[PDB]
């Protein structure tokens, strides 16, 4: 036994709570809503902030505002070539990166025998890198992450190095990624029922 | 528990495997004094693990491992020659230079100690590090770095970056990899006994 399991019910309800509050705001990414609510309904789970796979671009170290990163565009599904030229057009300083973020999920668990499950099954949906995040005396975390990660390197210091038909190539293969996260993210929540005790 | 009480043979094996590994030069010499510190411990042991790694390899599609191959691998930081003549052996499919970050691979006697590692690794710079697994006969650790790139160099044949990008690249490719050794080293002193 221990502390997280202790505290389990009082850790569920908050995050519950919680998420009505982002789900009332529209902050809660429409993709995965369905998938985060049947999470929820499962007795030894609940959910923690999470999100969908997203392709950005974004300069570092920016050069402004005092902040490390700043996005140039973010995107929350298939991107065509002329958005991300866009985006890209207002580099100006630090390294310019286009990357590729598969989603990621937080799912609080009430027994070590519950968190170790829910890995099983996201790895065996194809997120190969879920794990255990954080046990404290208060929760334990899982992370369900899958691998289709990107980090593109294409300019710096407002110099891009490279051209519309390179970018192109870049963006097919992101949207490749996006589209495999999702029909991941599919055969998770169609699995997920079967979790129930 | 089971993991607990099977704790004291699974560290036999893993040194052994460990010790077979040195013999034959399997392991990056890289991180060779880190991986005895942990042992050293007495409730961890480590499995296979790897310093980190800049790469040049040709493949059918981004992220095809299980037909992706090495035309240069390197695990320290590299010089501009070296990338050059890697890629210079590219024949047909797509070339990519990538950057990954290390992954060590530590057992733990009990929950508590993995908690204990997790966290002392991620203040050492690897936010990525976690508890991979958890079964009868072992509870691995997982500690690795977010840090990576992945760049588009040519397609059968033909080679898109010109010369101050792949510069970039590299030079970039050469800050995350010093990066790498630098929070390995910081790990590694501060393996302290208790």
Redesign the interface.
Known sequence: YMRFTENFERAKKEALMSLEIALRKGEVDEDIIPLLKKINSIENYFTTSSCSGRISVMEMPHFGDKVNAKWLGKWHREVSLYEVLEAIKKHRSG?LWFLVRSPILHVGAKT?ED??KL?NLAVSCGFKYS?????SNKKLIV?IRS???????LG?NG?I??GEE?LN??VE?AN??MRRFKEKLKRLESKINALNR
Request: overall charge negative; aromatic content about 8%; charged content about 30%.
């Open positions: 390294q070590l968190a170790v890995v794990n255990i995040k954080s046990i992370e691998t289709e990660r990107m980090d593109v390197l710096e110099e190095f490279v390179y190539k870049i293969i490749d990624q």
